Design a binder for these strands. Structure first.
Length: 201
DNA sequence: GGCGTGCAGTGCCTTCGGCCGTGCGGTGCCTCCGTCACGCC
């Protein structure tokens, strides 16, 4: 059914990772942010509840929002909309999974919660950059960080998606036809993510 | 005069050290094809 009254109130560290390659257009990237913010207003943001991070990843990653930013939610969504279209020739899934592993989850800020890397991808990084890919995926598995591949478009690295799935059982993936189908699964996605978090005592 | 190796990594272990390995860009499924500088014999 369609979600009518949804407001994820659980203990969750949620990280948004946005493919910055030219595989997506300006507007197609604008829709991606639409999907993001639309999902943000469905979450209880608080340092004691649902924390969120936002990262655009090209050949290198720019973090618009950190988990500990401790700003106001109404602006956290503001930032997410002002995310610039990079259209780079390279969106390194390895590098960003690296960044997430060593930068975001270097320390465990809150053991009691669940961590989720929402990998919104639509491209294939150069093959030579995939060297230590599994390494990063597994490194996250050990730090108890779920990874959720979102396959947008015909160029979404199918191999890496399945490769990620294999690593961890709770590494379910969503394979979409385009940025269009993104909205059509807002409920099913947001639900899965939220329902994977522990509701506080 | 052909070869056969190259080397990333907050790598790894027995570390004042050595070994495992996508040498490298770039295409478009994939972990690879098709390349080029280097030494060595």
């Amino acid at each position: 059914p369609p979600l009518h009254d949804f407001y994820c109130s659980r203990l969750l560290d949620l990280v948004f990772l946005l493919d910055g390659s030219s595989r997506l257009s300006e507007a197609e990237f604008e829709v991606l942010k639409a999907f993001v913010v639309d999902m943000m207003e469905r979450l209880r943001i608080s340092q004691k509840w649902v924390r969120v991070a936002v990262v655009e990843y090209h050949d290198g990653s720019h973090a618009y929002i950190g988990l500990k930013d401790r700003k106001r939610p109404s602006e956290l969504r503001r930032i997410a909309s002002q995310v610039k279209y990079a259209g780079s020739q390279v969106a390194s899934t390895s590098e960003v999974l690296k960044y997430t592993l060593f930068q975001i989850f270097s320390k465990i800020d809150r053991p009691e919660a669940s961590r989720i890397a929402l990998l919104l991808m639509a491209s294939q990084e150069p093959q030579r950059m995939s060297r230590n890919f599994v390494r990063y995926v597994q490194g996250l598995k050990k730090k108890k960080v779920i990874v959720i591949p979102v396959g947008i478009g015909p160029h979404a690295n199918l191999k890496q998606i399945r490769l990620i799935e294999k690593q961890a059982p709770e590494n379910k993936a969503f394979v979409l036809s385009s940025v269009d189908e993104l909205e059509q699964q807002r409920d099913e996605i947001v639900s899965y993510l939220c329902d994977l978090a522990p509701e506080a005592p």
